[PDB]
Amino acid sequence: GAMGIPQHQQKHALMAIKAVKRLKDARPFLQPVDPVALNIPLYFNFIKRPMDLQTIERKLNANAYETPEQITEDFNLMVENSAKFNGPTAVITQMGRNIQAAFEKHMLNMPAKD
């Protein structure tokens, strides 16, 4: 329909995800957490709603976000999941905070809808 964010906003967010993916600090966040391959079997006992950068990109490409703020909601979910599972001051979480700060700066430059 016409309820997903329009192309200019979609493309700006896709650019921001591309940019974040060039940060080496994004490496833990590039793909969904696989608790078997990573041997962290309790992951889904703590994490109800997993999120990662590829999933955000896929949702952008599927025109599934209704507002730019919903993209930020998913990004914050991704990093808060790490804070809960790995810990607020764990290396992975702090790498998440670093990419989150960069993402926020790009999201401040989102073009207006109209």
Numbering used by the authors: 124 to 237
According to the publication:
The fungal Bromodomain and Extra‐Terminal (BET) protein Bdf1 is a potential antifungal target against invasive fungal infections. One attractive target is the fungal BET protein Bdf1, a global transcriptional regulator. BET proteins bind chromatin through their two bromodomains (BDs), BD1 and BD2, which specifically recognize histones acetylated on lysines. We show that Bdf1 is essential in C. glabrata, and that inactivation of both Bdf1 BDs induces lethality.
